[PDB]
Paper text:
We elucidated the crystal structures of Act c 10.0101 and Pun g 1.0101, nsLTP allergens from gold kiwifruit and pomegranate, respectively. These allergens both belong to the subfamily of 9-kDa LTPs.
Act c 10.0101 crystallized in the P21 space group with two protein molecules in the asymmetric units. The model was refined to 1.95Å resolution. Both protein chains include residues 1–92 (mature form of the protein) that are folded into a compact, mainly α-helical structure that is characteristic for nsLTPs. The Act c 10.0101 structure is stabilized by four disulfide bridges that are formed by the following pairs of cysteine residues: Cys4–Cys51, Cys14–Cys28, Cys29–Cys74, and Cys49–Cys88. We have identified three additional amino acids at the C-terminal end of the protein and modeled these amino acids as Lys-Ile-Ser, which is consistent with the sequence that is observed in homologous Act d 10.0101 and Act d 10.0201, as well as in agreement with the results of mass spectrometric analysis of the sample used for crystallization. The crystal structure revealed that Lys90 is solvent exposed, the side chain of Ile91 points toward the hydrophobic core of the protein, and the C-terminal carboxyl group of Ser92 forms a salt bridge with Arg45. The covalent ligand binding was shown in the case of oxylipin-conjugated barley 9-kDa LTP, where Asp7 of this nsLTP is responsible for the formation of the bond between the protein and lipid. This aspartic acid residue is conserved in Act c 10.0101 (Asp8), Act d 10.0101, Act d 10.0201, chickpea Cic a 3, tomato Sola l 7.0101, and wheat Tri a 14.0201, which suggests that these nsLTPs may have a similar mode of ligand binding and may also bind oxylipins. The difference in likely modes of ligand binding for Act c 10.0101 is not only related to the presence of the conserved aspartic acid residue in kiwifruit protein, but also the absence of a tyrosine residue in the Ω loop.
Numbering used by the authors: 1 to 92
Write the structure that this text describes.
């Protein structure tokens, strides 16, 4: 079980980067690592994906480019996309 509270809190330090781009903070990357360690089941990955979809929809300053590069720039293999347009049901 993962809540949007858990998911949104983990990426709270990433908002600077998500809205401006450049380089994520150490705490942002620690956040992305927390996200990966909490989404080991398909249910948790789909729940995470939905939470991050809803957050990207509400936070209008999020750059889609920055969202799609966040896991790559943190060195994290994160199996959850971050976009207001993703079909979260199609996630493995």
């Amino acid at each position: 079980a993962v809540s949007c509270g858990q998911v949104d809190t983990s990426l709270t330090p990433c908002l600077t980067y998500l809205t401006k781009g450049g380089t994520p903070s150490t705490q942002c990357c620690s956040g992305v690592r927390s996200l990966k360690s909490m989404t080991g089941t398909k249910a948790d990955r789909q729940a995470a994906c939905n939470c991050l979809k809803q957050a990207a929809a509400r936070y209008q300053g999020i750059k889609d480019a920055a969202a799609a590069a966040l896991s790559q720039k943190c060195g994290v293999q994160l199996s959850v996309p971050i976009s207001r347009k993703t079909d979260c049901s199609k996630i493995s």
